[PDB]
Structure 1
Amino acid sequence: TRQGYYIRELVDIFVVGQQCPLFEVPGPNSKRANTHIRDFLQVFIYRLFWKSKDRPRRIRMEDIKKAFPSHSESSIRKRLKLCAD
């Protein structure tokens, strides 16, 4: 860590074979992919509103632009359309 080194011994190590997947990874540009993209952004926006101390709760746009910098700001504008002014 930042403060120093720490040492443990280990005695047990597992080898994991070939995985049998139980969850389907979406494809690129899929409907499930884009749904997750906007849902994740919406959850981050709600949790930034919960963390806000001023009443009424207020956030800044460039916090979201620091978190999601590949997003066009139009997508963020629409996620803020419903729930913020």
Structure 2
Amino acid sequence: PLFEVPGPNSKRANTHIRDFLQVFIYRLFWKSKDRPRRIRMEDIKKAFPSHSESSIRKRLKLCADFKRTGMDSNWWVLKSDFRLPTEEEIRAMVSPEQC
């Protein structure tokens, strides 16, 4: 082996889960066709059932603003002053070897 496998609940392992969540959130904004871009909490929780919503609230507070709507299905609208990172910048965040 040439690449190090982390231990359970290590600092490297916990950083990887956070960054992979940050990668997946960003690509959901790139998939959204609405102007301004918007995503749902339900789509992240369906892909990440082992995360609490509060841990997802940490990754969404810096890049998105919560707009509540009169239905049990609400949107995270991308901040107008937040520049969404480009594709190759997302590529540098998490490599296939780290996964």
What band does the TM-score fall into relative to the shorter chain? 0.7 to 0.9
Deviations along 1:4-45, one digit per CA (max 9) or x if unpaired, are xxxxxxxxxxxxxxxxx0000000010000000000000000
SS of the aligned residue for 1:59 comes to strand
Q: In structure 2, which of residues 29, 47, 51 is the aligned counterpart of residue 67 of structure 1?
A: 47
Indicate the RMSD between aligned Cα atoms, in angstroms: 0.4
| TM-score of the two chains, using structure 1 as the length reference | 0.75
**Larger RCO, structure (CA 8 Å, separation 6 or more):** 2
Structure 1 partner of 2:57: 77
Percent of pairs with identical residues = 100
Structure 2 partner of 1:40: 20
Structure 2 partner of 1:3: none
Q: Is there any run of 5+ residues in structure 2 with no aligned partner, and where?
A: 66-99
- AA of the residue aligned to 1:78: K
Q: Number of matched residues?
A: 65
Structure 2 partner of 1:53: 33
CA distance in structure 1 between the aligned counterparts of 2:55 and 2:62, rounded to whole angstroms? 12
Runs of 4+ in structure 1 deviating by more than 2 angstroms, as ranges, are: none
Q: Is there any run of 5+ residues in structure 1 with no aligned partner, and where?
A: 1-20
CA distance in structure 2 between the aligned counterparts of 1:82 and 1:37, rounded to whole angstroms? 18
